[PDB]
Amino acid sequence: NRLKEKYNKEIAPALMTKFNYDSVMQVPKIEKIVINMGVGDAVQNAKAIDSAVEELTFIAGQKPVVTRAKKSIAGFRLREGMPIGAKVTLRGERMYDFLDKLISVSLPRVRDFRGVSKKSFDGRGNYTLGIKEQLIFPEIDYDKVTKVRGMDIVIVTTANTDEEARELLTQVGMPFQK
Amino acid sequence: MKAGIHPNFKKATVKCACGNEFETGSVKEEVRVEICSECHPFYTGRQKFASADGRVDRFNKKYG
Amino acid sequence: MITKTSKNAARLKRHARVRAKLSGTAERPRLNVFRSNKHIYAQIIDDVNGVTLASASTLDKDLNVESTGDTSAATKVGELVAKRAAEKGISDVVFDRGGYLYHGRVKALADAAREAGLKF
Amino acid sequence: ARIAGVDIPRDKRVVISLTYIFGIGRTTAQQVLKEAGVSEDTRVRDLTEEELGKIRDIIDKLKVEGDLRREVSLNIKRLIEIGSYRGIRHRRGLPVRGQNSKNNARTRKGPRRTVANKK
RNA sequence: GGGCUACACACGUGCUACAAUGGACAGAACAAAGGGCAGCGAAACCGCGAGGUUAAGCCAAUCCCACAAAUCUGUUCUCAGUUCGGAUCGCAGUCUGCAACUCGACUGCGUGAAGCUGGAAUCGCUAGUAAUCGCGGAUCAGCAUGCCGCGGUGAAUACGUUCC
RNA sequence: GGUCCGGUAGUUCAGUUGGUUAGAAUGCCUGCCUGUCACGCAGGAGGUCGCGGGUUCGAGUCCCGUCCGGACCGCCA
RNA sequence: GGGGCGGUCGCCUCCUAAAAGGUAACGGAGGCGCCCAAAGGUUCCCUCAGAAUGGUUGGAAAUCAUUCGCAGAGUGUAAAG
RNA sequence: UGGUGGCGAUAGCGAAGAGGUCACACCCGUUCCCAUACCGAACACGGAAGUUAAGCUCUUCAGCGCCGAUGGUAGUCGGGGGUUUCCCCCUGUGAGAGUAGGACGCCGCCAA
């Protein structure tokens, strides 16, 4: 909750002076994060896609749900049924308890990483990010999982423009390659 | 919040080799962490860390 | 960036589908329900004339819950709606759940009316 | 994972355990351990709660995994844009140091196959 | 100045390995023969190393090249693309030479291919031979996995002329 | 002219019905065998399924059209 | 539109059929001798295809976020409605 | 001003201005009822700190969508005549399309 108090006292007042706001009260707000698994099956016979689903319980406490395909693909499995990947939509106090782990711990842990996200902005608001290691998340043990599985994060901004959406992220302490 | 599906979250105690600590929440009562933003060279201003990038390039080779 | 539909217009679509399920009018009055965030209004209207045969609300100079706008206090107002209907001899009114789920506390308003002698 | 060179293994003595680091080799490990005074110690991984940190600092002075990969990468990219001839050997499949081609030198050439006959 | 060193590939012939009879570290121990004055160059000192600084002695059964290596004795790794092997390449040095890009050698550091004994087929050798470990020389400014020698360790089998 | 059957490695034939996948012989290429060839031994490549569409998740396969190669009819005054 | 040969014989959709319906030809385009205990019943909820932008192993597409989408979707199977 | 109706986007999109003490809302909580192929987003419940920014209503706009004549022609009815794979005139019908114009709403009930 320390991150949650942080924008209630530090970020917002500074954000208010950076440019004018209609009706004073208006301020961009984080909405939902969506973590993707993908897995890739390779090919369909994981055999246990659910074993990957258990792994995501560590990255976030919200229960993952498998994303069943709504369309068949000629190049890869499969027609509808036998779900591929999983999805999570953490909210509330969980939102900043998770984001606090992201800046302070997750991103710096990565080897080659120093900073990203420049062209990444939609020009509308939403942020996107890729995650390629479970070593990135401290709660996971090294002994578990063995083979690497992919991950994603999508922060949402209330702001109608990326110029406002970006400035909100900078005060959060989010890294940028610059 | 479904009962018995979501693991319990006791107040976490994040720690680090530099002695930095962070108060959050996790399934584990205590969480040692190898790296923190207060220790990582990028987040900590522009520390030389190990570079000293561009030393030397594209030329500086002379010996008399 | 998100712009979800307001918690109102989506209800009207959920309300309109209910309208097909029952004609309501047949010289027999219907009872619509509207749950505003503060409190629930209640009204009674019948086709073709569209005249409001009876109406009542939690927000009135008469009667004090006094807490108002929650729990069993609404049942006193829901019972009050039937008491107005009782003067007309009304009736056996169909209930209009609207887009809101039938469980409560809007359900509690329906429960008191049955105790008040309305036939449904 | 891990505290110094990323992804050092387990159930192995510390010297070979950090020779695996993309940077330090054998003799360099002998030097950093000579600074350490560990004496080997420890066959598995159990060093000391703070000594692991002070060693983490000395290893931190050495540099550095994927950025060291960026050193060689930026170096050969410097060796191709310069003209060139050395990077030319780097991408012909030609050995660079200078050791013919009429036989062997398959380290870059690969195995298969063959496309000639006479007569 | 190039090229004789080409490069998609084939073949001949060597070298190094694919490892626990082993790898790595430490200690200890046994040679022969050959070369050396436009040379060998000790010892002392500097550099992690290569070498450098300086310089005794030796026309040599005197002195120098020069330390033998396998081995033995212990410590350590405990069966894997590995503390197996070293390829390839990067960076930084070094010897020779007016001069090391083509196209030299060596060293330090870093990078750690392939290969876990190899199809069809084929070669050598009857004892100090095969097996294997080091050393020297001719060549030579520099460049020897080739060649010519030196010694260390050191077997298995030969029923026999059916067959090639 | 009218129906029916086929078109797939260089060549000659399987795989088609059973819808998610292409094999065999020979030939070709490589290394051996012999002082020379063949033969023999040990390895290797090579077909996009005649073409043009449709159906379907996906077509050598199913459904059509078309271009070819064959096999039957083309009769009675 | 002589017979023989070929093809066809029943049911369902559209057009030809001419703004009720009907309506012929060896007229023009297609399907069916099924399928499903659920894809049925009821109740409570939800809205598509495709496009643009951002993104790990994701490439023209498996997954996810967003503006756009009066239906360019889906409606077991084929057409109309 | 809120709720709930009837009239065929003449009720709409879009653009520019306005509002809130009450009312309507966003908003604040998840201990309870209920909850979520998971989720207090939604769905349910109980709270008034913050404001109209959005939603909600008012005031403007013909850029788009919509409504839409009058008048003409196409077609055609009952007829007739030729140069008849069709064409021409008489009688009664009358489109489309475009334009003039209309329009960014009215009529009700209930509550304050």
mmCIF file of all heavy atoms in Angstrom, chain E residues 119-133:
data_model
loop_
_atom_site.group_PDB
_atom_site.id
_atom_site.type_symbol
_atom_site.label_atom_id
_atom_site.label_comp_id
_atom_site.label_asym_id
_atom_site.label_seq_id
_atom_site.Cartn_x
_atom_site.Cartn_y
_atom_site.Cartn_z
ATOM 1 P P G E 119 32.758 -48.117 -37.838
ATOM 2 O OP1 G E 119 32.446 -48.842 -36.580
ATOM 3 O OP2 G E 119 34.140 -48.152 -38.379
ATOM 4 O "O5'" G E 119 31.771 -48.650 -38.968
ATOM 5 C "C5'" G E 119 30.381 -48.794 -38.712
ATOM 6 C "C4'" G E 119 29.574 -48.727 -39.983
ATOM 7 O "O4'" G E 119 29.431 -47.347 -40.409
ATOM 8 C "C3'" G E 119 30.177 -49.425 -41.192
ATOM 9 O "O3'" G E 119 29.955 -50.825 -41.186
ATOM 10 C "C2'" G E 119 29.513 -48.705 -42.358
ATOM 11 O "O2'" G E 119 28.194 -49.192 -42.564
ATOM 12 C "C1'" G E 119 29.422 -47.276 -41.820
ATOM 13 N N9 G E 119 30.556 -46.440 -42.257
ATOM 14 C C8 G E 119 31.582 -45.965 -41.476
ATOM 15 N N7 G E 119 32.443 -45.245 -42.143
ATOM 16 C C5 G E 119 31.955 -45.243 -43.443
ATOM 17 C C6 G E 119 32.466 -44.626 -44.614
ATOM 18 O O6 G E 119 33.485 -43.937 -44.741
ATOM 19 N N1 G E 119 31.659 -44.880 -45.718
ATOM 20 C C2 G E 119 30.508 -45.628 -45.699
ATOM 21 N N2 G E 119 29.869 -45.756 -46.870
ATOM 22 N N3 G E 119 30.021 -46.208 -44.614
ATOM 23 C C4 G E 119 30.790 -45.975 -43.529
ATOM 24 P P A E 120 31.169 -51.835 -41.485
ATOM 25 O OP1 A E 120 30.755 -53.179 -41.071
ATOM 26 O OP2 A E 120 32.392 -51.251 -40.929
ATOM 27 O "O5'" A E 120 31.295 -51.824 -43.072
ATOM 28 C "C5'" A E 120 30.197 -52.193 -43.893
ATOM 29 C "C4'" A E 120 30.392 -51.732 -45.315
ATOM 30 O "O4'" A E 120 30.327 -50.281 -45.374
ATOM 31 C "C3'" A E 120 31.735 -52.070 -45.945
ATOM 32 O "O3'" A E 120 31.801 -53.395 -46.442
ATOM 33 C "C2'" A E 120 31.872 -51.002 -47.020
ATOM 34 O "O2'" A E 120 31.061 -51.314 -48.143
ATOM 35 C "C1'" A E 120 31.267 -49.795 -46.309
ATOM 36 N N9 A E 120 32.289 -49.020 -45.580
ATOM 37 C C8 A E 120 32.525 -49.097 -44.248
ATOM 38 N N7 A E 120 33.541 -48.237 -43.949
ATOM 39 C C5 A E 120 33.936 -47.625 -45.116
ATOM 40 C C6 A E 120 34.925 -46.667 -45.383
ATOM 41 N N6 A E 120 35.549 -46.052 -44.369
ATOM 42 N N1 A E 120 35.113 -46.220 -46.646
ATOM 43 C C2 A E 120 34.331 -46.708 -47.671
ATOM 44 N N3 A E 120 33.360 -47.648 -47.411
ATOM 45 C C4 A E 120 33.169 -48.104 -46.119
ATOM 46 P P A E 121 32.957 -54.389 -45.933
ATOM 47 O OP1 A E 121 32.904 -55.603 -46.752
ATOM 48 O OP2 A E 121 32.857 -54.493 -44.475
ATOM 49 O "O5'" A E 121 34.308 -53.619 -46.280
ATOM 50 C "C5'" A E 121 34.682 -53.374 -47.627
ATOM 51 C "C4'" A E 121 35.613 -52.193 -47.739
ATOM 52 O "O4'" A E 121 35.146 -51.110 -46.895
ATOM 53 C "C3'" A E 121 37.040 -52.421 -47.274
ATOM 54 O "O3'" A E 121 37.830 -53.110 -48.229
ATOM 55 C "C2'" A E 121 37.521 -51.006 -46.984
ATOM 56 O "O2'" A E 121 37.864 -50.335 -48.187
ATOM 57 C "C1'" A E 121 36.249 -50.365 -46.419
ATOM 58 N N9 A E 121 36.230 -50.387 -44.944
ATOM 59 C C8 A E 121 35.391 -51.124 -44.179
ATOM 60 N N7 A E 121 35.684 -50.874 -42.870
ATOM 61 C C5 A E 121 36.719 -49.968 -42.831
ATOM 62 C C6 A E 121 37.406 -49.372 -41.762
ATOM 63 N N6 A E 121 37.189 -49.797 -40.511
ATOM 64 N N1 A E 121 38.410 -48.495 -42.001
ATOM 65 C C2 A E 121 38.755 -48.188 -43.300
ATOM 66 N N3 A E 121 38.082 -48.772 -44.350
ATOM 67 C C4 A E 121 37.057 -49.668 -44.104
ATOM 68 P P U E 122 38.928 -54.179 -47.746
ATOM 69 O OP1 U E 122 39.412 -54.914 -48.942
ATOM 70 O OP2 U E 122 38.363 -54.934 -46.599
ATOM 71 O "O5'" U E 122 40.125 -53.280 -47.203
ATOM 72 C "C5'" U E 122 40.736 -52.306 -48.035
ATOM 73 C "C4'" U E 122 41.567 -51.334 -47.236
ATOM 74 O "O4'" U E 122 40.732 -50.645 -46.270
ATOM 75 C "C3'" U E 122 42.677 -51.939 -46.394
ATOM 76 O "O3'" U E 122 43.833 -52.253 -47.147
ATOM 77 C "C2'" U E 122 42.905 -50.869 -45.333
ATOM 78 O "O2'" U E 122 43.681 -49.801 -45.857
ATOM 79 C "C1'" U E 122 41.480 -50.360 -45.105
ATOM 80 N N1 U E 122 40.832 -51.016 -43.946
ATOM 81 C C2 U E 122 41.130 -50.520 -42.692
ATOM 82 O O2 U E 122 41.889 -49.582 -42.519
ATOM 83 N N3 U E 122 40.508 -51.159 -41.646
ATOM 84 C C4 U E 122 39.634 -52.223 -41.732
ATOM 85 O O4 U E 122 39.151 -52.694 -40.701
ATOM 86 C C5 U E 122 39.377 -52.680 -43.064
ATOM 87 C C6 U E 122 39.969 -52.076 -44.100
ATOM 88 P P C E 123 44.888 -53.331 -46.593
ATOM 89 O OP1 C E 123 45.687 -53.829 -47.742
ATOM 90 O OP2 C E 123 44.153 -54.297 -45.736
ATOM 91 O "O5'" C E 123 45.851 -52.475 -45.657
ATOM 92 C "C5'" C E 123 46.524 -51.333 -46.163
ATOM 93 C "C4'" C E 123 47.323 -50.639 -45.089
ATOM 94 O "O4'" C E 123 46.431 -50.046 -44.111
ATOM 95 C "C3'" C E 123 48.237 -51.526 -44.261
ATOM 96 O "O3'" C E 123 49.455 -51.831 -44.916
ATOM 97 C "C2'" C E 123 48.411 -50.718 -42.983
ATOM 98 O "O2'" C E 123 49.358 -49.677 -43.173
ATOM 99 C "C1'" C E 123 47.026 -50.087 -42.831
ATOM 100 N N1 C E 123 46.153 -50.866 -41.921
ATOM 101 C C2 C E 123 46.304 -50.698 -40.541
ATOM 102 O O2 C E 123 47.161 -49.904 -40.123
ATOM 103 N N3 C E 123 45.514 -51.400 -39.697
ATOM 104 C C4 C E 123 44.603 -52.243 -40.181
ATOM 105 N N4 C E 123 43.847 -52.914 -39.309
ATOM 106 C C5 C E 123 44.426 -52.436 -41.582
ATOM 107 C C6 C E 123 45.213 -51.733 -42.407
ATOM 108 P P G E 124 50.228 -53.201 -44.585
ATOM 109 O OP1 G E 124 51.187 -53.468 -45.686
ATOM 110 O OP2 G E 124 49.214 -54.226 -44.227
ATOM 111 O "O5'" G E 124 51.063 -52.859 -43.273
ATOM 112 C "C5'" G E 124 51.950 -51.749 -43.246
ATOM 113 C "C4'" G E 124 52.309 -51.362 -41.835
ATOM 114 O "O4'" G E 124 51.117 -50.944 -41.121
ATOM 115 C "C3'" G E 124 52.889 -52.469 -40.971
ATOM 116 O "O3'" G E 124 54.272 -52.674 -41.202
ATOM 117 C "C2'" G E 124 52.567 -51.995 -39.560
ATOM 118 O "O2'" G E 124 53.489 -50.999 -39.145
ATOM 119 C "C1'" G E 124 51.203 -51.336 -39.767
ATOM 120 N N9 G E 124 50.090 -52.260 -39.475
ATOM 121 C C8 G E 124 49.323 -52.942 -40.388
ATOM 122 N N7 G E 124 48.407 -53.688 -39.835
ATOM 123 C C5 G E 124 48.579 -53.486 -38.473
ATOM 124 C C6 G E 124 47.875 -54.032 -37.369
ATOM 125 O O6 G E 124 46.928 -54.828 -37.377
ATOM 126 N N1 G E 124 48.375 -53.561 -36.161
ATOM 127 C C2 G E 124 49.418 -52.680 -36.026
ATOM 128 N N2 G E 124 49.751 -52.348 -34.770
ATOM 129 N N3 G E 124 50.084 -52.163 -37.047
ATOM 130 C C4 G E 124 49.614 -52.607 -38.233
ATOM 131 P P C E 125 54.810 -54.110 -41.684
ATOM 132 O OP1 C E 125 55.975 -53.889 -42.578
ATOM 133 O OP2 C E 125 53.649 -54.896 -42.172
ATOM 134 O "O5'" C E 125 55.337 -54.791 -40.345
ATOM 135 C "C5'" C E 125 56.262 -54.121 -39.502
ATOM 136 C "C4'" C E 125 55.923 -54.317 -38.047
ATOM 137 O "O4'" C E 125 54.592 -53.802 -37.785
ATOM 138 C "C3'" C E 125 55.864 -55.760 -37.569
ATOM 139 O "O3'" C E 125 57.144 -56.290 -37.268
ATOM 140 C "C2'" C E 125 54.936 -55.676 -36.364
ATOM 141 O "O2'" C E 125 55.633 -55.190 -35.226
ATOM 142 C "C1'" C E 125 53.945 -54.602 -36.818
ATOM 143 N N1 C E 125 52.725 -55.182 -37.424
ATOM 144 C C2 C E 125 51.645 -55.488 -36.593
ATOM 145 O O2 C E 125 51.743 -55.266 -35.377
ATOM 146 N N3 C E 125 50.523 -56.014 -37.136
ATOM 147 C C4 C E 125 50.455 -56.238 -38.449
ATOM 148 N N4 C E 125 49.329 -56.761 -38.939
ATOM 149 C C5 C E 125 51.538 -55.936 -39.319
ATOM 150 C C6 C E 125 52.641 -55.415 -38.770
ATOM 151 P P U E 126 57.561 -57.748 -37.797
ATOM 152 O OP1 U E 126 59.026 -57.747 -38.038
ATOM 153 O OP2 U E 126 56.638 -58.122 -38.898
ATOM 154 O "O5'" U E 126 57.268 -58.702 -36.557
ATOM 155 C "C5'" U E 126 57.676 -58.328 -35.245
ATOM 156 C "C4'" U E 126 57.980 -59.529 -34.381
ATOM 157 O "O4'" U E 126 56.752 -60.257 -34.112
ATOM 158 C "C3'" U E 126 58.961 -60.541 -34.975
ATOM 159 O "O3'" U E 126 59.782 -61.070 -33.935
ATOM 160 C "C2'" U E 126 58.038 -61.637 -35.501
ATOM 161 O "O2'" U E 126 58.637 -62.912 -35.598
ATOM 162 C "C1'" U E 126 56.918 -61.616 -34.466
ATOM 163 N N1 U E 126 55.633 -62.126 -34.963
ATOM 164 C C2 U E 126 54.737 -62.599 -34.026
ATOM 165 O O2 U E 126 54.971 -62.585 -32.832
ATOM 166 N N3 U E 126 53.553 -63.070 -34.537
ATOM 167 C C4 U E 126 53.189 -63.125 -35.866
ATOM 168 O O4 U E 126 52.087 -63.580 -36.175
ATOM 169 C C5 U E 126 54.176 -62.627 -36.776
ATOM 170 C C6 U E 126 55.336 -62.157 -36.306
ATOM 171 P P A E 127 61.102 -60.279 -33.472
ATOM 172 O OP1 A E 127 61.577 -59.487 -34.610
ATOM 173 O OP2 A E 127 62.004 -61.236 -32.828
ATOM 174 O "O5'" A E 127 60.572 -59.271 -32.359
ATOM 175 C "C5'" A E 127 61.180 -57.996 -32.178
ATOM 176 C "C4'" A E 127 61.523 -57.739 -30.732
ATOM 177 O "O4'" A E 127 60.297 -57.561 -29.971
ATOM 178 C "C3'" A E 127 62.306 -58.857 -30.035
ATOM 179 O "O3'" A E 127 63.289 -58.282 -29.176
ATOM 180 C "C2'" A E 127 61.238 -59.547 -29.188
ATOM 181 O "O2'" A E 127 61.732 -60.211 -28.045
ATOM 182 C "C1'" A E 127 60.343 -58.372 -28.818
ATOM 183 N N9 A E 127 58.975 -58.750 -28.456
ATOM 184 C C8 A E 127 57.941 -58.958 -29.309
ATOM 185 N N7 A E 127 56.844 -59.294 -28.567
ATOM 186 C C5 A E 127 57.213 -59.295 -27.239
ATOM 187 C C6 A E 127 56.506 -59.564 -26.055
ATOM 188 N N6 A E 127 55.176 -59.722 -26.095
ATOM 189 N N1 A E 127 57.130 -59.489 -24.857
ATOM 190 C C2 A E 127 58.463 -59.149 -24.792
ATOM 191 N N3 A E 127 59.158 -58.886 -25.948
ATOM 192 C C4 A E 127 58.520 -58.962 -27.172
ATOM 193 P P G E 128 64.826 -58.206 -29.639
ATOM 194 O OP1 G E 128 64.859 -57.787 -31.063
ATOM 195 O OP2 G E 128 65.493 -59.469 -29.229
ATOM 196 O "O5'" G E 128 65.431 -57.021 -28.762
ATOM 197 C "C5'" G E 128 65.385 -55.673 -29.218
ATOM 198 C "C4'" G E 128 63.981 -55.119 -29.186
ATOM 199 O "O4'" G E 128 63.352 -55.481 -27.924
ATOM 200 C "C3'" G E 128 63.878 -53.600 -29.293
ATOM 201 O "O3'" G E 128 62.684 -53.253 -29.993
ATOM 202 C "C2'" G E 128 63.752 -53.172 -27.835
ATOM 203 O "O2'" G E 128 63.132 -51.919 -27.643
ATOM 204 C "C1'" G E 128 62.918 -54.311 -27.257
ATOM 205 N N9 G E 128 63.093 -54.509 -25.817
ATOM 206 C C8 G E 128 64.266 -54.449 -25.105
ATOM 207 N N7 G E 128 64.103 -54.670 -23.829
ATOM 208 C C5 G E 128 62.739 -54.888 -23.689
ATOM 209 C C6 G E 128 61.966 -55.176 -22.534
ATOM 210 O O6 G E 128 62.346 -55.302 -21.363
ATOM 211 N N1 G E 128 60.618 -55.322 -22.844
ATOM 212 C C2 G E 128 60.080 -55.206 -24.102
ATOM 213 N N2 G E 128 58.753 -55.382 -24.197
ATOM 214 N N3 G E 128 60.788 -54.937 -25.186
ATOM 215 C C4 G E 128 62.100 -54.791 -24.907
ATOM 216 P P U E 129 62.588 -51.857 -30.785
ATOM 217 O OP1 U E 129 63.833 -51.691 -31.575
ATOM 218 O OP2 U E 129 62.190 -50.805 -29.814
ATOM 219 O "O5'" U E 129 61.381 -52.072 -31.801
ATOM 220 C "C5'" U E 129 61.594 -52.659 -33.076
ATOM 221 C "C4'" U E 129 60.395 -53.456 -33.522
ATOM 222 O "O4'" U E 129 60.323 -54.696 -32.772
ATOM 223 C "C3'" U E 129 59.040 -52.804 -33.290
ATOM 224 O "O3'" U E 129 58.703 -51.858 -34.289
ATOM 225 C "C2'" U E 129 58.100 -54.000 -33.238
ATOM 226 O "O2'" U E 129 57.806 -54.465 -34.547
ATOM 227 C "C1'" U E 129 58.974 -55.042 -32.540
ATOM 228 N N1 U E 129 58.742 -55.081 -31.077
ATOM 229 C C2 U E 129 57.625 -55.753 -30.617
ATOM 230 O O2 U E 129 56.826 -56.304 -31.354
ATOM 231 N N3 U E 129 57.474 -55.751 -29.253
ATOM 232 C C4 U E 129 58.305 -55.165 -28.322
ATOM 233 O O4 U E 129 58.031 -55.252 -27.124
ATOM 234 C C5 U E 129 59.439 -54.493 -28.877
ATOM 235 C C6 U E 129 59.613 -54.476 -30.202
ATOM 236 P P A E 130 58.029 -50.458 -33.882
ATOM 237 O OP1 A E 130 57.910 -49.651 -35.099
ATOM 238 O OP2 A E 130 58.742 -49.925 -32.719
ATOM 239 O "O5'" A E 130 56.555 -50.856 -33.429
ATOM 240 C "C5'" A E 130 55.584 -51.247 -34.387
ATOM 241 C "C4'" A E 130 54.408 -51.930 -33.738
ATOM 242 O "O4'" A E 130 54.871 -52.993 -32.865
ATOM 243 C "C3'" A E 130 53.549 -51.067 -32.828
ATOM 244 O "O3'" A E 130 52.647 -50.229 -33.530
ATOM 245 C "C2'" A E 130 52.871 -52.105 -31.949
ATOM 246 O "O2'" A E 130 51.824 -52.754 -32.656
ATOM 247 C "C1'" A E 130 54.010 -53.105 -31.749
ATOM 248 N N9 A E 130 54.780 -52.809 -30.526
ATOM 249 C C8 A E 130 56.113 -52.573 -30.452
ATOM 250 N N7 A E 130 56.430 -52.335 -29.144
ATOM 251 C C5 A E 130 55.267 -52.425 -28.409
ATOM 252 C C6 A E 130 55.003 -52.274 -27.039
ATOM 253 N N6 A E 130 55.972 -51.852 -26.216
ATOM 254 N N1 A E 130 53.744 -52.416 -26.565
ATOM 255 C C2 A E 130 52.713 -52.709 -27.427
ATOM 256 N N3 A E 130 52.968 -52.858 -28.771
ATOM 257 C C4 A E 130 54.256 -52.712 -29.255
ATOM 258 P P A E 131 52.502 -48.682 -33.119
ATOM 259 O OP1 A E 131 51.370 -48.113 -33.854
ATOM 260 O OP2 A E 131 53.824 -48.059 -33.221
ATOM 261 O "O5'" A E 131 52.104 -48.725 -31.578
ATOM 262 C "C5'" A E 131 50.828 -49.190 -31.164
ATOM 263 C "C4'" A E 131 50.633 -49.002 -29.682
ATOM 264 O "O4'" A E 131 51.510 -49.902 -28.953
ATOM 265 C "C3'" A E 131 50.980 -47.623 -29.139
ATOM 266 O "O3'" A E 131 49.944 -46.675 -29.323
ATOM 267 C "C2'" A E 131 51.300 -47.913 -27.681
ATOM 268 O "O2'" A E 131 50.108 -48.106 -26.933
ATOM 269 C "C1'" A E 131 52.016 -49.257 -27.802
ATOM 270 N N9 A E 131 53.473 -49.092 -27.961
ATOM 271 C C8 A E 131 54.144 -49.115 -29.138
ATOM 272 N N7 A E 131 55.469 -48.927 -28.874
ATOM 273 C C5 A E 131 55.615 -48.785 -27.514
ATOM 274 C C6 A E 131 56.743 -48.573 -26.707
ATOM 275 N N6 A E 131 57.921 -48.278 -27.272
ATOM 276 N N1 A E 131 56.606 -48.469 -25.364
ATOM 277 C C2 A E 131 55.358 -48.571 -24.789
ATOM 278 N N3 A E 131 54.251 -48.779 -25.579
ATOM 279 C C4 A E 131 54.390 -48.886 -26.951
ATOM 280 P P U E 132 50.250 -45.279 -30.060
ATOM 281 O OP1 U E 132 48.957 -44.691 -30.492
ATOM 282 O OP2 U E 132 51.322 -45.515 -31.061
ATOM 283 O "O5'" U E 132 50.851 -44.359 -28.907
ATOM 284 C "C5'" U E 132 50.116 -44.117 -27.716
ATOM 285 C "C4'" U E 132 51.027 -43.952 -26.526
ATOM 286 O "O4'" U E 132 51.968 -45.054 -26.471
ATOM 287 C "C3'" U E 132 51.911 -42.716 -26.523
ATOM 288 O "O3'" U E 132 51.225 -41.549 -26.103
ATOM 289 C "C2'" U E 132 53.047 -43.126 -25.595
ATOM 290 O "O2'" U E 132 52.649 -43.019 -24.235
ATOM 291 C "C1'" U E 132 53.197 -44.610 -25.935
ATOM 292 N N1 U E 132 54.273 -44.855 -26.922
ATOM 293 C C2 U E 132 55.545 -45.037 -26.419
ATOM 294 O O2 U E 132 55.785 -45.004 -25.226
ATOM 295 N N3 U E 132 56.521 -45.261 -27.359
ATOM 296 C C4 U E 132 56.349 -45.318 -28.727
ATOM 297 O O4 U E 132 57.324 -45.529 -29.450
ATOM 298 C C5 U E 132 55.003 -45.120 -29.170
ATOM 299 C C6 U E 132 54.033 -44.900 -28.276
ATOM 300 P P C E 133 51.755 -40.098 -26.544
ATOM 301 O OP1 C E 133 50.664 -39.118 -26.312
ATOM 302 O OP2 C E 133 52.360 -40.219 -27.894
ATOM 303 O "O5'" C E 133 52.924 -39.788 -25.507
ATOM 304 C "C5'" C E 133 52.675 -39.793 -24.109
ATOM 305 C "C4'" C E 133 53.944 -39.597 -23.321
ATOM 306 O "O4'" C E 133 54.822 -40.737 -23.501
ATOM 307 C "C3'" C E 133 54.799 -38.408 -23.725
ATOM 308 O "O3'" C E 133 54.327 -37.185 -23.185
ATOM 309 C "C2'" C E 133 56.183 -38.805 -23.227
ATOM 310 O "O2'" C E 133 56.300 -38.574 -21.831
ATOM 311 C "C1'" C E 133 56.171 -40.318 -23.466
ATOM 312 N N1 C E 133 56.824 -40.694 -24.742
ATOM 313 C C2 C E 133 58.217 -40.813 -24.770
ATOM 314 O O2 C E 133 58.859 -40.595 -23.733
ATOM 315 N N3 C E 133 58.830 -41.158 -25.926
ATOM 316 C C4 C E 133 58.108 -41.385 -27.023
ATOM 317 N N4 C E 133 58.757 -41.723 -28.140
ATOM 318 C C5 C E 133 56.687 -41.274 -27.023
ATOM 319 C C6 C E 133 56.092 -40.931 -25.873
#
